[PDB]
Design a protein around this ligand. Structure first.
Ligand SMILES: CCCCCCCCC[C@@H](O)CSCCNC(=O)CCNC(=O)[C@H](O)C(C)(C)COP(=O)(O)OP(=O)(O)OC[C@H]1O[C@@H](n2cnc3c(N)ncnc32)[C@H](O)[C@@H]1OP(=O)(O)O
Ligand SMILES: CCCCCCCCC[C@@H](O)CSCCNC(=O)CCNC(=O)[C@H](O)C(C)(C)COP(=O)(O)OP(=O)(O)OC[C@H]1O[C@@H](n2cnc3c(N)ncnc32)[C@H](O)[C@@H]1OP(=O)(O)O
Lengths: 172, 195
């Protein structure tokens, strides 16, 4: 049972720096780091590449603010347009972030809607901040939105909205 | 240039039988099989870098980064007169999200791949601007689905594509999506559109 949401030697300096800043944020308990594990042959999609090759990320959650931040570094195996991250790898990390935000707020959910605007392409081996927030809850409906930005927060790469439906275990 | 859109021992009978059916559809010439590779063909890399975007590898196509059967297994067939691209897709165990089912991002990925390849046939080098997915029913691991996309309208550099994700018998609708793709303006050119 290995935790992948901790620094390894594939991590760019920018990702290490940001991770350290968010670990400091965790000092008073207002933020908290989420461990992540690999998982027949079935494995978690975002944790199925070797180190550095696929998704490298850590999530930090702020309960008071119902906010999830994903620090994310995309490896060479996530390529779409030459030199950039595939639009589906972006959707994947968006979904994993906004979904985990809903799940920390309110428990088990599944994505019903995912609406992504790609504003600027993301360079392969770059590091981004996915910042999501729970906007409103309406019964079983969780409305989470987010944005993907450069580490320095100058560049806006993507914006997304999403709807998660809390499952009713007495039905599934 | 090894073609990954051909049958291999991981392809279950439904993927294999549905490949044969679309291969039959290709005989009259109305449909055509697309190849797919682990890496973009060097002609398109050259074109892309030299005229559009170069950010200054082990690089390989996201959808083709899994060994046989574990990830995305797929083939695309295109109909030019219908402006319609169909992807036959089988999702392996490494695509798991909810236990037993394909991750929403791996569904988004195969949707993006399909609608994106549809936009490219009509528009050349394009990139995703919007991708709007409704996930209606969960897709079980190792199931074979069809992604059916069509180009709905072209307006300047805008290509609007729709699609559906369906079971082989078409009775179960897993997902539906809409999308906007945008034909890239070369880096050294003006557009010269409104704005
Ligand atoms: C052969 C095998 C190879 C395999 C291939 C392998 C892999 C395949 C690769 C795959 O992985 C798929 S690429 C997947 C990842 N995609 C991206 O990263 C795209 C990032 N975005 C951009 O680079 C730019 O934003 C883009 C180039 C898209 C547009 O940038 P520009 O060109 O500068 O566009 P303008 O800003 O002048 O806007 C143009 C018009 O569009 C409108 N518009 C724009 N965005 C919109 C939105 N989100 N909703 C609604 N509308 C939107 C806008 O209002 C305007 O309309 P008007 O206002 O009516 O004029
Ligand atoms: C699982 C553990 C996580 C693992 C960790 C991995 C994590 C990675 C995460 C990824 O893996 C992602 S989870 C994997 C990807 N997700 C899926 O495949 C979900 C497929 N969908 C479904 O199973 C069902 O549609 C769902 C369970 C979503 C809802 O099924 P039901 O329970 O039958 O709910 P109802 O259908 O009665 O509708 C409920 C309400 O929502 C409204 N609505 C529904 N869809 C809508 C849409 N698209 N737009 C707008 N609205 C929509 C609807 O109008 C209704 O509203 P009201 O009638 O006004 O109340």
């Amino acid at each position: 049972l290995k935790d992948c949401s901790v620094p390894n030697p594939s991590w760019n300096k920018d990702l290490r720096l940001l991770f350290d800043q968010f670990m400091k944020k965790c000092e008073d308990g207002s933020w908290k780091r989420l461990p992540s594990y690999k998982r027949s042959q079935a494995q978690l999609f975002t944790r199925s590449f070797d180190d550095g090759l696929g998704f490298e990320y850590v999530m930090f959650y702020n309960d008071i603010e119902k906010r999830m931040v994903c620090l994310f570094q995309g490896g060479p195996y996530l390529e779409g347009p030459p030199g950039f991250i595939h639009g589906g790898a972006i959707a994947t990390m968006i979904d994993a972030t906004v979904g985990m935000c809903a799940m920390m707020a309110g428990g088990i959910v599944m994505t019903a809607n995912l609406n992504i605007n790609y504003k600027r392409p993301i360079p392969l081996c770059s590091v981004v901040m996915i910042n999501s927030q729970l906007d409103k809850v309406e019964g079983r409906k969780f409305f989470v939105s987010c944005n993907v930005q450069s580490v320095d927060e100058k560049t806006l790469y993507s914006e997304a909205t999403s709807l998660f439906i809390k499952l009713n275990p007495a039905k599934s």
